[PDB]
Design a protein around this ligand. Structure first.
Ligand code: FON
Ligand code: TYD
Ligand code: TYD
Ligand code: CL
Ligand code: NA
Ligand code: NA
Ligand code: NA
Ligand code: NA
Ligand code: NA
Ligand code: NA
Lengths: 399, 398
């Protein structure tokens, strides 16, 4: 007889709700969605789309205020909840910082920008204020020095998901503890603190700070940082210290732009992801290696979720797959419909008739049991297309 | 031995002064910052001190040619060519714990950002800005109650001592250098704060806004304002208004209460002026009721007069004892270097009542101190022919 209202967006809303349906089938779910959920799966899943496809009713916040016997759980939700319009106090939020620091907006950027080594996710009570209610559970997150705003956000989504799952029973059974947030070190950033319509690198800063600007503004689906309108994908601190005014362009080549700072010169790497992606169809690793300035560009994706590893698999480019995996690519990487590397590779196998590299991919960790967001395995697609012969081949190599 | 002092303000004066007393064989050349007006304000003019002490004033171009000098920058404002000197004895005092807080407004940014500490750094002048290898640092604890002005004064004081503590090593190539790290480096330009258009930001937490107050509280430049009304500090309240941050919840003659992102804040209206006036004649019981922030007791008017000075001038000894027990400086000075003892001396002359001198002495009054014309209180008594008071005060000297 319990009820829960899940209000928000992206993979956190989707995977928390999924868990509920799998492990809490018993509980009635109502969903609230954000204003800019279009019902189309982008780099994050559409929660609106998920709810419609699963017959989970979508309600408004107005209506949510009047359900007395429900828990309310907000996950990247875009609406100011007014707690007094509820007739209960079981209102919970996952905020993407280690509160009491970084209340408010852009928590994937500000910690990077300010030079933080760590951040966190915090489950808390909702009160009238913004990210101010009492803390229930938290988890510290390491921000690696290579990681971008995008990587950080994806960690938020992932850890935020687990924290909810590790606590949701206590929320449902009213078995949780709370602690008021401290005054000291409390910080907050409004939407006005960064103007993503007019984003600008500031070279009157240290190299350290400037590399953190790049990192903090590297979130491809929104933007990359620019210099003279040229997109940049990361950069490094050089050993030289130019006499010239900070902001002064020291060199341009095909791959990079070097710039004067307050202290050390920085090299900014021109974004060539699109060129790299094209090249991953047929080129060997030797050729890709020379294209690469920052190693992490190998794990970037275009607006459909296609990565270098995914493109490599689609064209059977097995020596490149191996290399990409050795550099840290995910052998089970997915695009934004959940289509896996193994599914792309199956297309290559059908087209070429060369099945011989499957065994080696399986040894790299390739997982044939995974399902896309229609809940199909590669096996279901083969059976549907009537390729029984390739189906049994693939079956025999899985583990 | 020989030294070029390039810079401005009290630290440059203090180090130069110290050198003329404790190392009278050293030759000194100065460079002054262009915008030194030659006139003392709440900071002393280095240019003025140099002209009055016949210290030669030279330019960067000249400094490059003096091969047997060390070059000491005490907030010098010009980029130098390090390698153009024929030596590498090139030093700078910077008012931060480097590599953090490179650049400008180092009395503000650390407080704004919620730091508990800062410091001063003696380092090499090298390529970059504020980036040369570290020679010696002093950590400074920034107390929760301390303003920009309090921190600036610690910088002056501690930087001066940093220099003095290390001056032999500087003159004799006997220091140890450690190149700075890059990690946690920060820098702020002069564009990062616009002091001609300061606005408090209330879309912030209580902690941040109190730290804004502190950071912007530097009376001789400005105080923070709400409704064009000046504020001297404030406090966090345990209540939490539903009203948009920045909404005024209450006002009276003492204070203004405002909504924040989290905890309501009380902003205390600046009543220093009222306090200073009252110090002429009120006792501590009355004064204590005017105070909303203890440290307003140590502010100064445009001449440099504090409560303890006004009290001494008026022979208000009961209040001096109290002020001192609150942390005041019994030897405070105005912007001419006129000490508390000099003001009290005037009171003794006007009153003919000398008996309170022992009480101030026991509170720590120092009569040997000198003003910026270099006179003690005894010298002024001499010049004025007040031989009786001079004899009375002299009786106290061991
Ligand atoms: N070569 C050299 N390096 C130094 O680090 C140094 C010297 N000389 N000489 C003395 C002092 C000078 N430090 C500075 C610091 C900032 C500006 C300056 O013009 N800053 C501007 C604008 C530049 C920008 O932001 O790009 C500002 O932001 O306020 C000038 C001199 N200094 C100490 O070691
Ligand atoms: C709106 C926006 C966000 N971002 C980054 C910073 C944010 O932390 C991150 C997620 O932003 P967003 O998708 O707005 O989610 P949330 O509002 O829940 O933080 O995306 C950009 O890089 N550019 C943008 O224009
Ligand atoms: C110029 C200025 C400085 N300050 C503070 C910030 C600084 O760290 C501190 C000392 O500055 P100061 O050494 O006077 O810097 P400047 O070269 O600009 O004179 O005073 C103000 O509060 N208001 C102001 O208008
Ligand atoms: Cl198929
Ligand atoms: Na209610
Ligand atoms: Na914005
Ligand atoms: Na530079
Ligand atoms: Na001259
Ligand atoms: Na300014
Ligand atoms: Na409030």
């Amino acid at each position: 007889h319990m009820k829960i209202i899940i209000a928000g967006k992206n993979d956190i809303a989707v995977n928390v709700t999924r868990w509920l349906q799998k492990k809490k089938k018993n509980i009635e779910i109502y969903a609230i969605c954000n204003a800019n959920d279009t019902g189309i799966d982008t780099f994050q899943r559409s929660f609106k789309k998920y709810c419609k496809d699963n017959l989970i009713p979508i309600i408004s916040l107005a209506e949510a205020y009047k359900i007395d016997d429900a828990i309310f759980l907000s996950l990247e939700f875009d609406k100011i909840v007014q707690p007094s319009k509820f007739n209960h106090n079981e209102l919970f939020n996952i905020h993407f910082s280690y509160l009491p620091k970084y209340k408010g907006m852009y928590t994937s950027a500000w910690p990077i920008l300010n030079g933080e080594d760590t951040s966190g996710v915090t489950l808390h009570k909702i009160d009238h204020g913004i990210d101010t209610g009492a803390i229930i559970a938290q988890k510290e997150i390491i921000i690696q020095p290579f990681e971008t705003a995008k990587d950080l956000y994806e960690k938020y989504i992932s850890e935020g998901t687990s924290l909810v799952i590790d606590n949701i029973s206590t929320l449902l059974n009213s078995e949780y503890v709370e602690k008021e947030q401290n005054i000291k070190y409390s910080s907050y950033y409004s939407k006005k603190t960064i103007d993503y319509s007019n984003l600008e690198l500031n070279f009157s800063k240290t190299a350290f700070e400037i590399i953190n600007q790049l990192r903090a503004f590297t979130f491809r689906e929104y933007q990359l940082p620019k210099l003279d309108g040229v997109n940049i994908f990361l950069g490094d601190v050089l050993s030289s210290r130019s006499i010239m005014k900070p902001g002064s362009i020291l060199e341009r080549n095909d791959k990079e732009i070097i710039v004067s700072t307050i202290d050390y010169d920085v090299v900014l790497y021109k974004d060539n992801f699109k060129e790299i992606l094209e090249a991953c169809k047929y080129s060997d690793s030797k050729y890709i290696a020379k294209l690469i300035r920052a190693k992490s560009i190998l794990f970037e994706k275009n607006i459909y979720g296609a990565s270098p590893v995914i493109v490599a698999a689609y064209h059977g480019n097995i020596e490149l797959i191996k290399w990409l995996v050795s550099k840290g690519a995910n052998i089970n990487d997915r695009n934004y419909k959940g289509t896996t590397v193994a599914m792309y590779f199956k297309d290559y196998m059908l087209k070429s008739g060369d099945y011989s590299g499957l065994k080696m991919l399986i040894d790299l960790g390739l997982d044939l049991t995974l399902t896309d967001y229609k809940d199909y395995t590669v096996f279901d697609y083969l059976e549907k297309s009537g390729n029984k012969n390739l189906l049994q081949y693939m079956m025999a190599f899985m583990k």
